[PDB]
Amino acid sequence: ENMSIVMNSQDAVPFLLDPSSHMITVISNYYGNKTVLLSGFVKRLENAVRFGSVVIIQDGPIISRLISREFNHAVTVEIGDHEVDVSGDFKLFIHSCDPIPIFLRSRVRLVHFVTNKESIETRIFDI
């Protein structure tokens, strides 16, 4: 259901709270050549926007227009300090490993990846 919520988010961006770094690996395995990682960087994000490449950023403020779909149609995206043309297939992902600002939290589709006593109870019942 974590991956279902991830794939069923076409409006709000999903969150990858994965200190185990498994979600990023399975996402990159599914995607392939359309995966680019970050952590200059504004220029490479604008280049990825213009090319039409899915971007994943680690360690989650100037991506407000892209995260809010504040696009200008004449379809151009005003990102950073210069407008970037939209290919239409651009997608963005957010990854973090620390189990967060309120504005980001109320906007990103947050999910939890934590095993606890409830998890071990579910595991022993399943086995």
Added chain:
Amino acid sequence: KLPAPLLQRTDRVVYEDIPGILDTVKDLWGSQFFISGVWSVYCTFLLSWFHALITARTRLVPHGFSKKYYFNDCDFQFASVYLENVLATNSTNNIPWAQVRDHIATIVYGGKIDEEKDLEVVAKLCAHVFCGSDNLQIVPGVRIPQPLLQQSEEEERARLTAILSNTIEPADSLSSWLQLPRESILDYERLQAKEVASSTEQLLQE
């Protein structure tokens, strides 16, 4: 502190070697190889027994000592070299007991000790082991006779090994052999059980 990811993908094992006094002496003698005369071998024997006694007394944290110390083979090696140097140039056989006693107590086996009463009880153990009389009762049960003028290394080694092999380790050796009253170790195990029971009571509250 060990790194976190190495200790989780492994089988963590904890050991405890037997703390009996006799096995320490036998291990020291097996590690030993003797090569100079017979009195040096006899003094090395006495020193190995002293090291075994102090290693046994080390584990008694609040009663045998005042702080957990860590003796090893190197301290015994330096004491052995000191003994062979003293009985290698003082060939008159008029044994300088005060020299070896003070140098072992205050320098070799007192190097890592800061407290005063610890050094006093180390000096007491030195006086007990190295009293230098006509007879030695290292424990109230067994005697280590002094060598004579008509032996070489092999016969003295055989005789002292026979003195090892006759006596079995007694059950209450942790008080009679170390020259400690029974109530002291009784209070020590009382505090041990008190800590264990208090910990189990604290874990039982959840």
Added chain:
Amino acid sequence: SLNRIKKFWKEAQYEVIEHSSGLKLVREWDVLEQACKEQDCLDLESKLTKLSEIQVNWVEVQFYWLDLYGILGENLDIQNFLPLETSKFKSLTSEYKMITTRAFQFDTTLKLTIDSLKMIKSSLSTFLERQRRQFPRFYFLGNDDLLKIIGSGKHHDQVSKFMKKMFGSIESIIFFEDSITGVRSVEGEVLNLNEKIELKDSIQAQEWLNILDTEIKLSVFTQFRDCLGQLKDGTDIEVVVSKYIFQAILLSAQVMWTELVEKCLQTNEFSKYWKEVDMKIKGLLDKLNKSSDNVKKKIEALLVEYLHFNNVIGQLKNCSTKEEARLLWAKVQKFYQKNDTLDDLNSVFISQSGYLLQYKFEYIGIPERLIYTPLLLVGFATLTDSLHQKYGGCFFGPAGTGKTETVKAFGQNLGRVVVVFNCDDSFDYQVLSRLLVGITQIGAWGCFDEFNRLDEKVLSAVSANIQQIQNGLQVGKSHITLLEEETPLSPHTAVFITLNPGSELPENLKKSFREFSMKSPQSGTIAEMILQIMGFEDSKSLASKIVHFLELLSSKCSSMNHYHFGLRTLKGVLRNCSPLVSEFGEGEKTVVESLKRVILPSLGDTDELVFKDELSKIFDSSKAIVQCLKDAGQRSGFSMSEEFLKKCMQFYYMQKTQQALILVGKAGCGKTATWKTVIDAMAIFDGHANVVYVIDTKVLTKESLYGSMLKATLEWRDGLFTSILRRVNDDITGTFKNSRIWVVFDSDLDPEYVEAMNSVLDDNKILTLPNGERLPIPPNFRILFETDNLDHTTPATITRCGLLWFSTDVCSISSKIDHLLNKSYEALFELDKLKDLISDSFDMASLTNIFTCSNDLVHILGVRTFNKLETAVQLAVHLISSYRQWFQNLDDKSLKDVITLLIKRSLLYALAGDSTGESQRAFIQTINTYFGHDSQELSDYSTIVILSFSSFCSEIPSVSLEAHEVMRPDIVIPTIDTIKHEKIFYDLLNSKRGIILCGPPGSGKTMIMNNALRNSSLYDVVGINFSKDTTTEHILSALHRHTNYVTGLTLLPKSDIKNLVLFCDEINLPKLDKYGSQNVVLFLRQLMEKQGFWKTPENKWVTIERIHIVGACNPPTDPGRIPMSERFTRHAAILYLGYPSGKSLSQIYEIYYKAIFKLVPEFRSYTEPFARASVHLYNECKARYSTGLQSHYLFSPRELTRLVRGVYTAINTGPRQTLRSLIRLWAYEAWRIFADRLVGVKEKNSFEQLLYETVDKYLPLGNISSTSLLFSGLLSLDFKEVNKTDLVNFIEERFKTFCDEELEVPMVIHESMVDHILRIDRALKQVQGHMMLIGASRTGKTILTRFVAWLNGLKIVQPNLSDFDMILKKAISDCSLKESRTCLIIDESNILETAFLERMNTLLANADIPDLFQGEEYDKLLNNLRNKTTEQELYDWFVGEIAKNLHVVFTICDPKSSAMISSPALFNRCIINWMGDWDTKTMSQVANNMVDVVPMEFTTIRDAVVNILIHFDRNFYQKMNPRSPGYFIDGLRALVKLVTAKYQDLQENQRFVNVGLEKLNSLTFEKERWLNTTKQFSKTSQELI
């Protein structure tokens, strides 16, 4: 990108800033790095890589060219030392010249240049390595010292000053007629070799220095052999003391003692040798009585040795048996000498506990011999035991218990120079590894002082290196492979470690070392032998008494941080005894006076009494300097006190010997006074002229203190400390050879500053500098530290410095009053009688009671009674000077009444300006009771005018000023309290005293300041608003715009008639540093106290003559405020600007209401009731609301000013109003300004009903509730209540226009967001309007702001510091040249630095910002505003247009800006809007008008699903901070989208099923399946919802 990169690459050049011709240099590296870092793309990448290669070549070539100029331009002997090396560096110079030429006039050629540079660097590194292979003692020093040594070969110098370094204990060399005959030790001992070292011109440094140390080994051996032979010939030691050098006599005497003691130990004989030793000791003491300095030091070292021999023999004669005799003899060090060994320098070995080691015959100088205690012998024994088996000794114990100097004493007694690595964080890997490799090469043993203080990686690296060295030592390997080199290893070397736990030795070093404990150094025998060698007839009893006294001092007294009573204090006392020995003789008197001179200055008060009582218990028991001190004090007016006299004599006797003295006491206790008067008396007495210097520490930086290498040019800069040190050390003018110099740091001690000051403080009198500048410290260079507390004083400095403690203030009140009066008299037929009258005015019988009944009151910014009398007497003298004109022609009763009134007012305003007004009243009746009713009694409103009694109510102007002035914030209304504040402020400013304004925010501190000084033609004001991070360049930039230098040496106002005054706001606001201090406030104290400071790039004393300092700050009790130390506030006074009374508010606002009724005079008779209404509502709000309920519950007249401003702008922008309509509009504005931050709607309705009661009490009327009020100007030409239906119709038309034009955002319309957009439109249409937005995320606040911005036609922008200022400049340029009313938005995510908050605070405390408009910006702005049309008029128009043409709205989530909300200047204008969380009605209506887009009703149910959603939301948040509505909104959006998709899919599926059924219409099964599907479809559809 490409065009800019190509343009800047073709524009690349060099800056002509280098010295002589050299290399053309370049600066601003980092900007170039930031700028620089298919076929066209790969060509650009290759060009970028080539450019980076050239860039690395550039930085390497200049970093190496600095040393190239250092070693080649100034000298050619370095490059001419060796033939092939000479050819290599001549080729180097040719390459350097040609690359300079081609740099003046390619990239691969310069890559070949860096290839040549790396191979010549390898060549010179190998050349240095080979030079150090010839002589590994050169490998001690760095490369530059090697180059200097090899350059000064034929020069034959500068090795005599590294002579301290490469051989340890030798100062300088001596050489006659180009031939060395010996060397001079660090002590200063002359030496003579076996033969003179003949020299030739073709000499290398390494060969003749190898000759030097080999022949000094042979020479010490020769003198030892000759001394041994002469002593074997029966010569008495007393005659041969002066013949041979210290090493020779030490070795020969100790070998002879060994031989004699073993001879007498072979029998049972000890008496004769002990008598001989006693006779030798007595004869040596007698020769010490009449010796010279070299003879004295040699004799005391030999007395240390012979006292040890005496102790050993006395111990041995107590040995009743022979076995304990061998026990005792075999434990001490035994010095044997071989006989048949043909090797000269291997003929002596040292026997210790059955082991032996080899002496190495190196000179040791004459250091202070470690006195021989038994624990020292045990440490020697265990170190011998460790060393005998190729191991290394490890020492551990408490701090300062005698480890490192014990290892150094081992090196001394074995005749080796030990290199000590004084462990600190500044150490790095390469130099310590180099010194370790040198220790391996030359075999010199090395200690490690406090090894545990290293960082983790460096400690691990040096542990690995030491482990390799030890492993090579045990196995006998002569070639250890470390530092990538197979270095030689002598078997005589060793490594030593000392540390202090409480960590221990690391396990890698622990497996190969041996530990030892030395916890208690035997102080009794040390003191006994020191007292014996000093010549005292009673050593044992005196030493025991000293030990008892030290332990009783350490036990009984309170353990202060700076206290120390261990061993170093004892040795310091014994060393300090000798100058007192020379006068008082030898006895108890000398040592008790030394104790009274050493430990007494460090004591406190109760500790002082305890020390005195113990001195009386244990021990039993020159006026020319006293007369000189009294004369100096009487000349300077400092009337002496018994405590003051004791302290001054104490400081003089302490500075008689010790160079470094630290004065400690609470601020304002007379430290500066006592050293000033002591040094003046010292200059009178001894005759030496005195020069003093005062420097503030924290305001200056370490770069401005010393200097550093420049970032780009690598040029050394001289700081202030380097400047003063170079001045006092050059002594070119000849002043500093007989003039006393005093560098005094008038600042608190800083650990990171005293870390650098330790290089000043250390005994070798040399300083560590980055540029390699060595500077000596002459004996007149006395350093003084005067501080206020010892919270951060390191214990390493509490003993090693000299400490003076000022526990109590050394001055009485009466003496301070007399001194202040005399100084005020001298600051100026009538002056004599005026001085007599002022002297008899201070009737101290009532003043004492005044002080006792005045110190009890609560002092805001609390200052004691010792620092307000300065302000009191100075104000009294200044007022008397002002009224001095008409006092010679009046009766005595009027004179005494006037002077009594003046001193009463002075005391009232100097002792009650730090408490409330009722405290001032109670103080005034207390004063009138104390002084009696005979004289004139000062009243609260009393004033003396031209010459009799008057009142403040006589001169008050009842001005009926205009109406529009209330928009201008600078206009002042007058009242009695305002005039009183202005009068006392004017008097304080004229009296040359500091002013500090305090009180609750809202009283108008800046406002009253600008009132008093805008009307003042005698002064000027520059105002600066402080920030969390404040720098000294703020104040300098502020003053430079209105002041000018002159000689600079003097800073003066630009005008010659107006004394300029610097104003500052929120002094408490700047934060402390990492060590609890603030620099700007100490800078202000430096300006306001000493009238001077130091320029940071020039180090010049900028004397101040016509500048006063004023300051307005919030009290430290409020949040965001940090208290100041009493040192700054002691120079100034306090004026508590409290809250004015409600009657004063009523008067002020009834003039305001007359002014606001000027526009519509039909209701001109109702000014008073509205003023009473506003006063009553504000007073009830204060008595009801408190800041405990919420952070932003601060109330002030700022609310009322905003109230009357809103009412005035409503009346200007509104039609004719009736009484009821005006009541309703005023209630609307009152609800807007007050009921927008309250707890809830219940508070709003409570305010509403209080408003009802007050209005019906004053204006005798239906519902005027919150939602019943709706005032706008969208549907009307002027502000009036418009209909909600047409309002929402108009905004709906604008909404659909915006969605068809620019952005069709998924927005909704409801009365709550109608209220929000109405409120924000009211704020945006008002001049200088701002808000906060207390709302959750995804609440549409920014969207509504953009909607209203489009509705108002506002231009839209989407917001580091430089880029922010550039955007501001572009925006204000567009505003000036186009009247662009552009809206600007800031979020909490938009702000990351506090500087933006600070500049908001500055521009909103003002209406503009002064320091961002200066220079070219100001000139261009004035030119452009003249194009649009005096500097003052143009700037006033600029302020007006930026007030009417700026709007910023801030969004916050958590109600780090809490102090910003609580900041009075931020709170002054912006109206705080609490958006809050959505209520149940709001969520229900937004859900109900989003559901209608998608038809869902096919099985009401909308209310049901919305109720379930909101109830689950509230249950989730209550069973899981404003509740975030983002979950609700994106849940409903996702539900709507899923419903649409699923309905379309189900419609398609049902159409397909119907088509299949029609086609089908064996068939029975299909019909049954179709019927079952049709029957279950409805249930499955309800289940699908």
